[PDB]
Amino acid sequence: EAPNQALLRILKETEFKKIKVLGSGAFGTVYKGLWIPEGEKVKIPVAIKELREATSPKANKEILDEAYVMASVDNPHVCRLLGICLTSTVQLIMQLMPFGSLLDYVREHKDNIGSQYLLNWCVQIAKGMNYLEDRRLVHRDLAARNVLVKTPQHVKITDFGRAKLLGAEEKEYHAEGGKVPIKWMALESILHRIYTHQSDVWSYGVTVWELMTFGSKPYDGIPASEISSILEKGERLPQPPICTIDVYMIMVKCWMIDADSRPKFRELIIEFSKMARDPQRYLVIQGDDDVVDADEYLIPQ
Ligand SMILES: COc1cc(N2CCC(N3CCN(C)CC3)CC2)c(NC(=O)C(Cl)Cl)cc1Nc1ncc(Cl)c(Nc2ccccc2P(C)(C)=O)n1
C-alpha cells in the first residue's frame, strides 16, 4: 500500500550502440552493447533486450511489466534495470553481466573453486531473495539459469518475466495457466499454482543443487508430468557428491512439504555465511577507457 516512487528512465535510442548478439530465443534477442549518456563523459556497458521482433501488442504488456518490476528493485544482488527505449520495438537496457549465466559458468569451469566460490554464491543469492522478500516480491523463476555473473566473486538474480509483487494482504499469487519450469517448483505450486516466498525457497534449493552438482539437470530423464507424483512419494534430488551432510541437509529442508518448516532466506544467509568461513569442512572437492560499470553510474536523475 506504499507508493512506488521509482523512476522510469527513457533513453534516446541514439545514446547507445548495439555491438554483438549474446544469445537469442524465447526472450527474443539480447545484444551486448554500450550506452553513452550524452555530454556525460562515461561509457556504460549494457545488455539490450527485445522480445523477438513481431508486433504482438500482448508482448509489450509483458516487457513493460518486467520493466516495472526491475525499475522497483535496487540491491547489490539483483539486476539493475537501466532504462527503456521507446522504439517501435521496446527495449530493456540492463547492466551487462560479462561472465554469462551461472549455469554456464559452473559447467564451463568445473575447475570451480570450492565453497569459497560455491558457498559464497549461495550466500549472495540468499541475500538477493531476502531483498525481494522485503519488497513483497515473488520471483517464481529462480534457477541457476536466471543468475548472472558480473565477476566470479559477484552474482545477481535476473529475469523478472514471471515476477509478481504481492499486495499488502496477499500470501499467495494464484496464477493462471502456461508453460512453467516444473522441475524447479514447489509442490504446492505444481498442484495448486499457489506461489509464495516459501515457494521461492524450494526453487532456491534446486538452484543450490544445480551449483553443487556443477550444472546437472534436475530429474534428468524424468518427464515433467511425473515430477508431481515423484515428489509426492517422498522422492527428492540426490545428495551431490561434493556435499557434506551439513549442506545436503540444508537443501533437503528447502524441499519439505509443509512450506512453513522450510527455512527462511534470512536464515539461509546465516547458515551459508557460517559454512563459507570454513569452506572445506562442508564441500569436498579435489584440488581446492572512459568506461564506468553501471554499479558506479548512479542516478543522473
Ligand atoms: C556479455 O557477457 C555475456 C556473455 C554471454 N555468453 C555466454 C558464454 C561467454 N563466455 C565468456 C565469459 N564467461 C567466461 C563464460 C563464457 C560469452 C557469451 C552471455 N550469454 C549466456 O551466458 C547464455 Cl544465456 Cl548464451 C550473457 C552475457 N551478459 C549478459 N548481461 C546481462 C544480461 Cl540481462 C544478459 N541476458 C541474457 C544474455 C543472453 C541470453 C539470455 C539472457 P537473459 C535476458 C534470459 O538473462 N546477459
- For ligand 1, whether the C-beta of 32 sits within 6 Å is yes
Set of cell numbers at residue 6: 521509482
Residue recorded with cell 563459507: 276
207 exposure class (CB count in 10 Å sphere: 0-12, 13-18, 19+): buried
125 exposure class (CB count in 10 Å sphere: 0-12, 13-18, 19+): buried
Set of cell numbers at residue 69: 518490476
- For ligand 1, whether the C-beta of 45 sits within 6 Å is no
Tell me which fold the domain 102-281 belongs to.
Transferase(Phosphotransferase); domain 1 (1.10.510)
- For ligand 1, whether the C-beta of 162 sits within 6 Å is no
CA of 99 to the centre of ligand 1 (A): 6
Set of cell numbers at residue 84: 527503456
CA of 193 to the centre of ligand 1 (A): 30
- For ligand 1, whether the C-beta of 50 sits within 6 Å is no
- Nearest by Cα to 59 from 14, 33, 81, 29: 29
Residue 96 DSSP symbol: -
**Rounded distance between C-alpha atoms, residue 95 and residue 26, angstroms:** 20
Kindly calculate the radius of gyration of the chain based on its CA atoms and give it in whole angstroms.
20
- Indicate the SS3 state at residue 216: coil
Query: What is the full DSSP assignment across 241-282?
Result: TTB-HHHHHHHHHTT-SSTTSSPPHHHHHHHHHHHTTSGGGT
Strands of 16-18's sheet in order across: 16-18, 29-35, 44-50, 91-95, 81-85
Which amino acid, one-letter code, is at 72? S
Alpha carbon 136 to chain centroid, angstroms: 16
Classify 16-96 by CATH class: alpha beta
202, 142 contact by CB (below 8 A): no
Contacts of 205 (CB under 8 A, 6+ apart): 251, 252, 253, 254, 255
Positions annotated as catalytic residues are 141
- For ligand 1, whether the C-beta of 91 sits within 6 Å is no
CA of 185 to the centre of ligand 1 (A): 24
Alpha carbon 95 to chain centroid, angstroms: 14
- For ligand 1, whether the C-beta of 106 sits within 6 Å is no
Q: Count of CB atoms within 10 A of residue 266's CB?
A: 13
Evaluate whether 16-96 and 102-281 have a shared fold.
Answer: no
Pocket test for ligand 1, best of 30, 66, 78 (most atoms within 8 A of CB): 30
Q: In Å, how far are 55, 155, 194, 284 from 48, measured between CA atoms? A: 18, 19, 32, 39
Resolution attained, angstroms:
3.0
15, 39 contact by CB (below 8 A): no
- Nearest by Cα to 280 from 153, 116, 112, 110: 116
Q: State the sign of the Cα–Cα–Cα–Cα dihedral 265, 269, 274, 279.
A: positive
Cα atoms in the Cβ-side hemisphere of radius 13 Å centred on 203: 27
Contacts of 218 (CB under 8 A, 6+ apart): 183, 184, 206, 209, 210, 237
Q: Give the distance between the most distant pair of CA atoms in the chain.
A: 63
CA of 18 to the centre of ligand 1 (A): 15
Q: Which helix (H) or strand (E) holds 146?
A: none
Query: What is the full DSSP assignment across 191-211?
Result: HH-EE-HHHHHHHHHHHHHHH
Number of residues assigned to the chain:
301
Set of cell numbers at residue 101: 549465466
Parallel, antiparallel, or unpaired for β 91-95 and 81-85? antiparallel
Pocket test for ligand 1, best of 92, 99, 102, 112 (most atoms within 8 A of CB): 99
- Nearest by Cα to 101 from 184, 158, 163: 158
Q: Where are the domains of the chain?
A: 16-96, 102-281
Name the residue at shortest CA distance from atom 20 of ligand 1.
100
